[PDB]
Amino acid sequence: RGSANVLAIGTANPPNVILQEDYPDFYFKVTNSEHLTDLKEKFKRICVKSKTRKRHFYLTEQILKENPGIATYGAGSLDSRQKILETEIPKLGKEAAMVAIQEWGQPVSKITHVVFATTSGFMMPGADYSITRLLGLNPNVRRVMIYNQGCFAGGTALRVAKDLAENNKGARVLVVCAENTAMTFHGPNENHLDVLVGQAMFSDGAAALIIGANPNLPEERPVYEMVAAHQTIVPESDGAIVAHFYEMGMSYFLKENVIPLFGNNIEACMEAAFKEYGISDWNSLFYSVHPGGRAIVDGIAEKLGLDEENLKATRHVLSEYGNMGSACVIFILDELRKKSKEEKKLTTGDGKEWGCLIGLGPGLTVETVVLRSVPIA
Template identity: 65%
Template sequence: MGISLYLARNLPKLVGSNIKNNMAEAFTPIGIKDWNSLFYVVHTGGAAILDQIQENLGLKEDKLRASRHVLSNYGNVGSPCVLFILDEVRKKSLEEGKTTTGDGLEWGVLFGFGPGEKTTTKKRYFHLTEEILKENPSMCKYGAPSLDARQEMVVPEVPKLGKEAALKAIQEWGQPVSKITHLVFCTSSGVDMPGADYQLTKLLGLNPSVNRYMIYKQNSYAGGTALRIAKDLAENNAGARVLVVCSEIVAMFFHGPSENHLDILKSQALFADGAAAVIVGANLDTLTEHPLFELVWASQAIVPNTEGASVGYLREMGVTFHLSETLPYVIGSNIENSMATAFSSISGGISDWNSLFYVVHPGLGTILDQIQENLGLKEDKLKASWHVLSEYGNMLGPSVLFVLDEMRKKSKEEGKKTTGDGLEWGVLFGFGSGLTVETVVLHSIPIITPPCGSATS
């Protein structure tokens, strides 16, 4: 039947909402900010795309005339389009007596658009090495039975990685491990009995009577789930101190390529190893404990009719994970309902979404784009999530805790008044299979700067 090509209805808006970022990245080194001072060679994907570019860049009516001319006279001829437009620009410039080949202007830009998605991830961390893969060739062949090899690898290492994160959290907390009353451990990497919660209890030397809660296979929303459960435990058990640990080694998700299963490449381009830990409590000892955020309200919800948007299957070959192309748009179209539900519980109500700070699971760049667009957020509102996606990738459950940590660190570094980018209220979002959404309303804590000359510990 040849090639089938499908275009999403929101493609023009998607191109339009990203065009400013592309322009800024291209022209900031040159020092150009006036988009009307340029000439344009823009692929003729469709009139709606050209309209969105013109609107989002604030271009004058004639700026895209070469593109509209080619679209009108030749249609969308694929990759040759931009060369047709380039030729049209230089011909018209000559015919109209312009001083340059670029409509009389010095600088211009050429844009082509097509299938694909940049992950925006620069770095990721993995337990897997070339040596490990050479020793386990079945992991490199799509469909080959390799579950035993993967289990033997991740089951002992997941709690060890979790231990490293837990020790950092405990050290910053500054209290002995004997004060930890509850443990919430989440992972989508490997399953065993007794579980990773049991192994971590031994590794940390926790009290044998510690109350343990093990969360398996909740993938990217697990960080939010763990915080919600920890909040309930802390509020309903006097004196409770809950250690939350999320640890992932994504060797279970790694597979060799397959021409018949190209959709798995997206998750493999995103997923990475990581671990994070926090301690949650209520009725703090203000002399010895110094909170970072307050968990005010938490809820989990399933988005109706979205079961296939994000799915994973445990097989003899490991875990196969599939992300629907519609996933970012499903999240984007439902995000305002989640916000309205969450903040209607706050006294006085909050409806200005730009008055909040955001701790959003960095699952995909397009998910962050859709959230920003649908909530009308300013450019820097999701900077903590973008930073984690760029520097660590999608670590599933730990990711949102990495974003929380980035938020409070940057707030302090930049001299903000609170741990939430200087703002009072914020929200944490986790998204995962179901489609399941975890929402946590956060209240920031004032950052106290010691007076000049005073000593700190």
């Protein structure tokens, strides 16, 4: 019995794109907030600085017209958010899952386990049930539904898949991460400027993987080896990110020091994960860093001394997709292996042997997955 491997990665996004250059005009119009000149000026500066070029959203002017509470800050809107989210999350998840299954090239009857992560709505039965039904998976698949673990849940999903894959001979785990801003969209309000930071970054996306130990070569094709998977609570961080699931939807609150609480601690997380394999040069590694806005990626870069090369996959997904929550770190893994093939590098990890996937979110929580690349040549 060996290490859990990534055998396939797939991604999906809803079709409707709003460019960041268009987004402030769009946002202030569909929330009937054009009278709030200062917030609109504040929001244009945040978006000009975001280094997100474009985002996909299921939410459109049409949907918001049909569900006006979603576009009114603090209005009872959760019922109508859930009516969207209950079906759109499994639906988008299925599309991401189909791309992974196609790459994998094996029948779906070989899938033994399903790990689904989202914070974009919830019901019983959950998105894990729904995607099982939509893909016609075996009814006896062993399911782990991961609700409401926010922007670190990509890490959590992989860490769970790792133990499922490694402890069960022949197990193939379908991992799906999906987010939909129907859960997080808020109109602007002078008292809750955290909303403007959210509306500059949050976006729709689904990513899927197939995880298995002991790949059947060469008809199965590993992309990454999962070596280790850690979770930690940052010291002195209690209350830094808090989200409530309220009648108005997901109401979230960020302290001033979120970026420096991650930044002053990330080096300790890298030592905890890499010391035992004798690694201390952080630029010797390839990276999937959760792109929770520009400031989080820049702070982690500054504190680890990461060069432009090691963050270009992370920054490409932030630019082209925005903060799709749990899905982002999986999009980055996809981008990383594609770019590696395109630039004729020796490994799926940008020519590097060892790598790091970092999930960041409430607690504050750091998810650290240690990866090895696979040869391309």
